């Protein structure tokens, strides 16, 4: 059951932007006293990891020897180190991050100072399975796109109603005072034609993934929650 709770928590969490020494990644981490689950990506490949208390203790002992800590304390310290970075960036961290892309696997090394002493950890993230990758990226993105299309349709209907009201005002023996405040009739086809050639090239640039985390996270979280509730 603990693994199931870890998976559900990882699914609930939103994407965050991580700036390594040279590159950038999109990461989602869920840490509990029983272990943790991590999912990283760079818009080309997705790596996933999930570890339990025993693995955490073994890795802590083998990496940073001379430290005798229970797995729960190590997990809590890892959460304290990671969560602030994911919530906000460009703030005092003092936690170096590095990545090594070994054959068909990734190693994410995190270094920090725990009360003025070294503290090292490594995430051994293997290639994520298609099922998990799909459930975490593809279906939520399609749901978000459909929701945004519905929002656009609703806004278009509202604009049509406002245009009808303006037409009624004009036809009711009216005379606009400020000619500058004159909105032209709204046409869906014309607006789409203008947009696709004026703003799509600059509005469809994902880049390194920063816009995705900065703009479409609330919708992503809502879609993921709805999918979880459905099934």
């Amino acid at each position: 059951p603990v693994m199931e709770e870890l998976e559900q928590g990882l699914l609930m969490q939103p994407w965050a932007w991580l700036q390594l020494a040279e590159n950038s990644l999109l990461a989602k981490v869920f840490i509990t006293k029983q272990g943790y689950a991590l999912l990283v990506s760079d818009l080309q490949q997705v790596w996933h990891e999930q570890v339990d208390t025993s693995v955490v203790s073994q890795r802590a002992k083998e990496l940073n020897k001379r430290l005798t800590a229970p797995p729960a304390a190590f997990l809590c310290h890892l959460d304290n180190l990671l969560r602030p970075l994911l919530k906000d960036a460009a703030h005092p961290s003092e936690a170096t991050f590095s990545c090594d892309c070994v054959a068909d696997a990734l190693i994410l090394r995190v270094r920090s100072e725990l009360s003025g002493l070294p503290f090292y950890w490594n995430f051994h993230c293997m290639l994520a399975s298609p099922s998990l990758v799909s459930q975490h990226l593809i279906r939520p993105l399609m749901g978000m796109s459909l929701a945004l299309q519905c929002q656009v349709r609703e806004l278009a209907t509202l604009l049509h109603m406002k245009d009808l009201e303006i037409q009624d005002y004009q036809e009711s023996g009216a005379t606009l005072i400020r000619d500058r405040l004159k909105t032209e009739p709204f046409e869906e086809n014309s607006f789409l034609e203008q947009f696709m050639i004026e703003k799509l090239p600059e509005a469809c640039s994902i880049g390194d993934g920063k816009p995705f985390v900065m703009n479409l996270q609330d919708l992503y979280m809502a879609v993921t929650t709805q999918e979880v509730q459905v099934g």
Partner: protein, 164 residues
């Protein structure tokens, strides 16, 4: 000023008050997170335990080190709290965050609840006094065109002889 809220919402007279205690900041004494809810006649407390805290945090997709006080305060501000009272148990539903949270509460013993009620009353009086004083104190107490002469280009300052 620990987060708290009163129910039912609206202009009707209050009939229930809920608040949270614990998770004190700083290096001083720290107590486990707990919720106290009273009708002014009976008191309900979580009676949580560290295993209970871990189970509650993991159940709702919340990390062990995650702090629940900000979520409680945000929900109290939004008045997204719902209550269901049983014969001897209470269920509290919070919808202030992205995901709904469920809490279970049991009646506190009377001998132990009475000192808790007295402390709550004294604290409420102190907060009322402090906030009233604060409110009383605060509420009342063309490029290259000269700007000077439009239509004439701004002449550059006279430099003179500048040897190369």
């Amino acid at each position: 000023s620990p987060p708290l809220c009163t129910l039912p919402p609206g202009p009707e007279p209050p009939r229930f008050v809920c608040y949270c205690e614990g998770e004190e900041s700083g290096e001083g004494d720290r107590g486990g997170f707990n919720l106290y809810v009273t009708d002014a006649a009976e008191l309900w407390s979580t009676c949580f335990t560290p295993d209970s805290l871990a189970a509650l945090k993991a159940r709702f997709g919340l990390s062990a080190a995650e702090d629940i006080t900000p979520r409680f305060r945000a929900a109290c501000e939004q008045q997204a709290v719902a209550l269901t009272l049983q014969e001897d148990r209470a269920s509290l539903t919070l919808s202030g965050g992205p995901s709904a949270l469920a809490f279970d509460l049991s009646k506190v013993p009377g001998p132990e609840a009475a000192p808790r009620l007295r402390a709550l009353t004294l604290g409420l009086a102190k907060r009322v006094w402090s906030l009233e004083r604060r409110l009383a104190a605060a509420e009342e107490t063309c490029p290259g065109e000269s700007l000077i002469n439009p239509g004439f280009k701004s002449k550059k300052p006279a430099g003179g002889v500048d040897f190369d």
